[PDB]
């Protein structure tokens, strides 16, 4: 009964910063990796990064290295992704996915319901 | 920097078999690309189906299989149901990042 | 004395003390009858031991697959060679000594007799010296047998020697000349200590489940013995090279300036100075300035530039070293070519690339522990945690075909290999093809310097470690499973776009996975077991078979007609297949009890006919005759095995159970019986006192020589070089001849 529950729809002004949460329940949070993935309509999906909350180890793509910051709160079993210097391209839907840490298994086991972020004025 | 390419859509009837293709820009898809197939149902319901080009997630129906055909990864659905109408994405593991495919809008007539 | 007491079974030959010719006539009858009984006991004790072998062996059904439709079905028995199984086989062959002492006490109205205690102490000398000497020699020339388990050998051999020392204690030290009730029981209760230690040693001291298994054919029809094995023109000044190469950890790079041409008998002055290229001064190399003086008759001078080591990954970088201001004291010397050298620094701070050696590996089910190497490639910097797990394939293993294992491998700094131990369950299958998988996960760099944590942008919690690396304090990442003081932890946590480039290269050196991240392990059947079963099937109603086998080359005829009476008589013993070896066990121990009742009488009347003492006739004759079952058990294990544990341990196991059950039970029954009458149980200590001390003195020499043959010049306890092989055998036979000769004289008061 693994469930990843995310925050609600959010609207932010351009040039601001925003924090997105994904609370994981039903499994050992600190022993599993968390994938963060971005979806835009007509642009497929882009893999933002991954975080291991046990050591707070991180993986990112070069494009999202400065743009996204992945943190963890293992006391409340939550993973956070913070976007800074928001622009028009950032209006998207963001997902968190469980990964066991092994590449032979699926890297995107259980997904969150998705949090939509709108950057407009 | 690589671009993963899929067919725009696939159209089948219930009970038939369909094959979905994952092509890599840099060359031939290998076992070091760890081809993942995930499924998007309507209203943003995402499910991870296959990882590691062969391994199938527990709880996924047995009709979904992953394989390597020629120089490209492939998802084979044998006896496709009407509930399998979805959008299927393929993720390929390069040296330090995941690249996702365009997504095949697989539709099953009903 | 010449007067003979009436035995348990045999009547007194009368009249007593008849003549001198009649003593020769009577003693010949008693000696030949006693030797014929010793021949009979060895036959029945062999069958008694084989029944014990079947009781303690698991029965397996072997399917033999064939290309044709018909596949034959065969049933075999596997007898595990453990200390607990071998202490029962050492118990089985010691039944003649154990039963003779009990029968002699109870048969003769619970009075201590000389024959029983002396044949137990005298058996120890024959076992410890003669049997071990024979086991040294039977090993083929050029082959050695070494005691692999030396901790077990020390504990067991001390306990067997203490058994004969403790026998002296109760007769001479504590209430001398009398055996008390608690003395008799405490002697008996040392026997369970032997049993529990055997069970403990198999579980924890030996780890018998996880050793490499070897299989040999047993002496029975379908028995297979499984044991442990070994797991398989003016002068000019210019640089020598013009481009120099170095690693980052070199410390200093060597540059050779050369003055050539002109006249050497002169003084030349040249300045040098480093200039930044891709590598920057103070961060990648030490800034260096100086002036080089060329003496008269001097041509080349070496200069050294310091290379600053660190922990961070970098690409290949270079810096420039120039020459300028050529001068001559008191034109003559000029600046030649090449006037500038380029030193290129090769970094070596990649955290590693982890992979398996091969993608598919084949192991046999008898491997015990399999070790899978995980390699670290192209860099070994920092501490890296590599998770791993086992995945079930065809081999459904949760203890069935293997034991599930998972964890994390921690590669230390500059460590390039680590192993994974997976426990493979041995099932004795004739044909097997099972598959399971072993996979390694994403590696994580858990330990690094502080400046590397800035460049990797690590946002976790770090505890400062006492270790130092490249002159900087070393920080270690806090995991969630660890609970620190929380004051110990440190959170290390507009860039100029040159520092941003510095971070990007630094992340190129983080640990990653290699070519083979998944291992497919194919468990297969043992070649040794498969060949062993193939040996059986080539050469392999059971009541009828024993009688046909009883009656069947001139030397063979002599042995056949000698033992034909015994073989036909012992063919009425039930076949071992009935009642899972217990039908043979009950009848065999009854017949052993019957034939050692006769041996006790035949040896008793033989001694008093010619005046020989019961102490002497037990040590020389009865002790040798009842250890014939022990000699063949040790001899087979000496040759057929790979180590000397089973061969020597049978000698040690026999010696312990001889005292603890043979004397412990017999003197417990006698002491309790006299205590019920309010009377003491008196055993004369003088005869047994000198025998047991002579044994222990001679036993330490035997144990000392066995430990001395562990040197590489000899190589092992058994076998070894032929010239040392005879000297060890002749010494131990000499110790036995010295023992039985000195003990005979002390019996007759000749000191
Ligand atoms: C304080 C304990 O006293 C004891 C004294 C003697 C005892 O008898 C034996 C002892 C060792 C034996 O073989 C040793 C051996 C065999 C082998 F195949 C593999 C590894 C081994 F180490 C056999 C009999 C016992 N059991 C207890
Ligand atoms: Ca006493
Ligand atoms: Ca450097
Ligand atoms: Ca540098
Ligand atoms: Ca470096
Ligand atoms: Ca270095
Ligand atoms: Ca076994
Ligand atoms: Na014995
Ligand atoms: Na014996
Ligand atoms: Na004996």
Numbering used by the authors:
A (entry chain H): 1 to 121
B (entry chain L): 0 to 109
C (entry chain A): 17 to 248, 370 to 467, 482 to 644, 652 to 698, 707 to 718, 737 to 935
Question: Can you quote the paper on this entry?
Answer:
To reveal the structural mechanism of its inhibition, we determined the structure of HsNCX1 in complex with SEA0400 at 2.9 Å. The SEA0400-bound NCX1 structure adopts an inward-facing, inactivated state identical to the apo NCX1 structure obtained at high Na+, nominal Ca2+-free condition (Xue et al.). SEA0400 binds at the TM domain in a pocket enclosed by the internal halves of TMs 8 (8a segment), 2 (2ab segments), 4, and 5. The pocket has a lateral fenestration in the middle of the membrane, which provides a portal for the SEA0400 entrance. The pocket is sealed off at the cytosolic side by E244 from the XIP β-sheet. As TM2ab directly interacts with SEA0400 in the inward-facing state, its bending movement toward the outward conformation would cause a direct collision with the inhibitor. Thus, the binding of SEA0400 stabilizes the exchanger in the inward-facing state and blocks the conformational change from the inward to the outward state. Thus, SEA0400 promotes NCX1 inactivation by stabilizing NCX1 in the inward-facing conformation, which facilitates the formation of the inactivation assembly. The formation of the inactivation assembly also reciprocally stabilizes SEA0400 binding as the XIP of the assembly interacts with the TM domain and seals off the inhibitor binding pocket from the cytosolic side. The Fab fragment from a monoclonal antibody against NCX1 was used as a fiducial marker to facilitate the single-particle alignment.
